[PDB]
Write a protein that binds this ligand. Structure first.
Ligand SMILES: CC(=O)N[C@@H]1[C@@H](O[C@@H]2O[C@H](CO)[C@H](O)[C@H](O)[C@H]2O)[C@@H](O)[C@@H](CO)O[C@H]1O
Ligand SMILES: CC(=O)N[C@@H]1[C@@H](O[C@@H]2O[C@H](CO)[C@H](O)[C@H](O)[C@H]2O)[C@@H](O)[C@@H](CO)O[C@H]1O
Ligand SMILES: CC(=O)N[C@@H]1[C@@H](O[C@@H]2O[C@H](CO)[C@H](O)[C@H](O)[C@H]2O)[C@@H](O)[C@@H](CO)O[C@H]1O
Ligand SMILES: CC(=O)N[C@@H]1[C@@H](O[C@@H]2O[C@H](CO)[C@H](O)[C@H](O)[C@H]2O)[C@@H](O)[C@@H](CO)O[C@H]1O
Ligand SMILES: [Ca+2]
Ligand SMILES: [Ca+2]
Ligand SMILES: [Ca+2]
Ligand SMILES: [Ca+2]
Ligand SMILES: [Mn+2]
Ligand SMILES: [Mn+2]
Ligand SMILES: [Mn+2]
Ligand SMILES: [Mn+2]
Lengths: 232, 232, 232, 232
């Protein structure tokens, strides 16, 4: 089988295994801080450098994957804690949208909220223009921030959140298990057929954004990943 | 919400938080050895003492859970490596079947392979009588060892295997990710309605068995678990 | 050429191929537990029974060797995790020091920390009396536990650690590669002239010790070894 | 820390993690055949796609690495079993030398036998022009196929050879351990300062060449690699 696996316990600048796009900045403690607090409509994304081949056109096979990661959102004085983080999968040629307004677009879509990606968001601001739930929420997105499905959640400031995601090639199910600092778990699942939504090779990464009045610290702390494609 | 969570990094006898059934024994290193290598048709089961309320007849809600465990199977000289380990969920009054032949029944079913339980099996022997796959395999079982669904796998002697299981109340999906010692991952998923197959209160646990000529070391090294039931 | 090679994927009692000295005990899962958790100043050592000719007096030649093994140290409640395991080479007539205090001596030296051996230590406790570094470490020992050279390391409870050793006769260089469970590698290398420090025939083996209040589970799980001495 | 690791138990076409250069072809059994048996001065190289950061100009640190791999060379009728395989490390922009004559250049150097790389060769043909020992041999090359150091070896046709390499950043020691199918080991070592001979970012891989009358099957079967750079 064809397996891809990596494990970051801390990050550093100048590491060929990662692509930094936009306002991303590596902190002295090894954390990745996605957006710049002093910039309007700041967008910062981090991608794993090597493109992963999630499905084969010759075998028609799709990959299964297990990935776990932890992040932290923290309030800054005077600004609204917005907009949130998003773990996504997108074509290898993926780039931050031209003229991106950041904000509720999460750094991955256009003004209408359309884009070419699939991912799980942790939304801390309800954008009525994208049909956001009235509360913080975790969501599954397929080519749009107007979530296919969402589950009510609570973003605690300065709280380390651990997430685990499982994609099963057979059922084409994408499972997510979020563990809040207080101990409670929030799970959400949905059948998304990657073979039909994304090309053969893609790139995994995280993104975050802010607006003029919406800014908060968005931190990625660790990230392990393992995918396996049946080659036969 | 109503959450239940424990984490065993090592086990010990006389700990009131665990039930020992059958030939189970706790090794000096803190591991739990499920079967007795000297006994014919040995069956051993370890259960978390406190029953967990997976669903409510009052609210009709079903809980969601995240659990992670690791095990190790090892070959012993002269005997065939059989039969396997099974992570199961069963009524609080669950006991090893009367007159259990061990072997292909993994300690949870009768001779015909029927019983009242739901779980993930790691089968190292093909029992044609239970329509077993021709290879080692992981499988989802619902009230029988004639698996509802299986996926080819490979048991590596002396290799420490890691399992992540997530159950999403909403979509009733049970997702399993198995990370082999060589790095490769194996995922299997299936929709199972706990509310219709199991009572409000259940017990989580592990069970392994052997026959006369089928014996091997079945070890449980660690196990963390968290379930949350929405109470409203 | 003259080559000696063996491979233990699991051990057993009553195997004339191995020497058990002290509190050693072979677990039902085949692992070797070096110390007794209930004894004060427990010392346990295991040696490969047949002596290996590491150098010829006639030809002046020294043998090269490649050896690989895996262990596991696990904490036990109420006691400090000590003292560590040491892979050693010693005279065929080697035995545990008379009146051994266990502890910092690692079962291979006297109270001053002096003995006849060459080895690699995985020290989990800082013994000032032997100039131990302030943290966990891997060290190279030539006739003393006051390491010739050390490198910071981290012992993780219940984690299986793999180690690779290569000794090249020409450069008299002993290189060590430790693979922690988290993925990272810790290497350390040193020039040690075996011909001048040890006799023509030696015995390879492991050893671990504890004191009154310092005890932990020390396990050896597997061991492959090969050496070749040019005979011409 | 900064760790990079991968594990290839078999290879496959169209895999984004590998760069194929020259006459490389992936066989149905998942083996890589480096040279074309019907081509004069055939050359084939296969590299890991992601460039690895071996040292940091900011910290002045060098990484350490453990790598294990197996290969097989086989004789084809009428042609001389030539020329051998070489595991090398070169600058990320590395390519097959223009007008490479194959043969004793091993695909990594010009006609004079010079180039920019470091590596371990398994040379099956004595090229006087490069001061080749009169027998088959394993050697350490630093910017030239005129080995800095060699050790006599024997290449058995159709035999699967295992090789283990370790590089300790501290001593700057590159140690190799070769295991012949017959059981005997061949070790070789040498202090090479990578920080001085190679740039910050390099790519690892294997190369193989042949001439008009020198041809044989060069197969790569597996390859595991792990390197760690202290980031602080
Ligand atoms: C489209 C736009 O950028 N509007 C600005 C406001 O943006 C929203 O801000 C919230 C937080 O209040 C959140 O980040 C949301 O996604 C944004 O669309 C906000 O920045 C406001 C403060 O003056 O200015 C608006 O123009
Ligand atoms: C029904 C029964 O117990 N039959 C015995 C055999 O049991 C099978 O053994 C395999 C391993 O071969 C495996 O554990 C399977 O589940 C069992 O049904 C086996 O013990 C055999 C050896 O002599 O005796 C049969 O009577
Ligand atoms: C000399 C001696 O044996 N002292 C006892 C202590 O031993 C040290 O203990 C540490 C762990 O705390 C470690 O083993 C070290 O190698 C030993 O020197 C320790 O056992 C202590 C607990 O009460 O009693 C001392 O007297
Ligand atoms: C420089 C060159 O290409 N010479 C040809 C010979 O090449 C050598 O062949 C041996 C095996 O005989 C080996 O590969 C060596 O590295 C090569 O240089 C050889 O092919 C010969 C047969 O007619 O022709 C030469 O010109
Ligand atoms: Ca939003
Ligand atoms: Ca079976
Ligand atoms: Ca010590
Ligand atoms: Ca040559
Ligand atoms: Mn949203
Ligand atoms: Mn089965
Ligand atoms: Mn020490
Ligand atoms: Mn040469």
């Amino acid at each position: 089988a064809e397996t891809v696996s990596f494990n970051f316990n801390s990050f550093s600048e100048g590491n060929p295994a990662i692509n930094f796009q936009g306002d991303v900045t590596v902190l002295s403690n090894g954390n990745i801080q996605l957006t710049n607090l002093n910039k309007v409509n700041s967008v910062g994304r981090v991608l794993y450098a090597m493109p992963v081949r999630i499905w084969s056109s010759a075998t028609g096979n799709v990959a299964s994957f297990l990935t776990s990661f932890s992040f932290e959102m923290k309030d800054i004085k005077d600004y609204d804690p917005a907009d949130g983080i998003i773990f996504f999968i997108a074509p290898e040629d993926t780039q931050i949208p031209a003229g991106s307004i950041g904000g509720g677009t999460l750094g991955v879509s256009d003004t209408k909220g359309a884009g070419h990606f699939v991912g799980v968001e942790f939304d801390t601001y309800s954008n009525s223009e994208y049909n956001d739930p009235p509360t913080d929420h975790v969501g599954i997105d397929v080519n749009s921030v107007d979530s296919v499905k969402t589950v009510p959640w609570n973003s605690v400031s300065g709280a380390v959140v651990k997430v685990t995601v499982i994609y099963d090639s057979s059922t084409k199910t994408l499972s997510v298990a979020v563990t809040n600092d207080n101990g409670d778990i929030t799970t959400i699942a949905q059948v998304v057929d990657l073979k039909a939504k994304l090309p053969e090779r893609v790139k995994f990464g995280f993104s975050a954004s802010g607006s003029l009045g919406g800014r908060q610290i968005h931190l990625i702390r660790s990230w392990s990943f393992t995918s396996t494609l049946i080659t036969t």
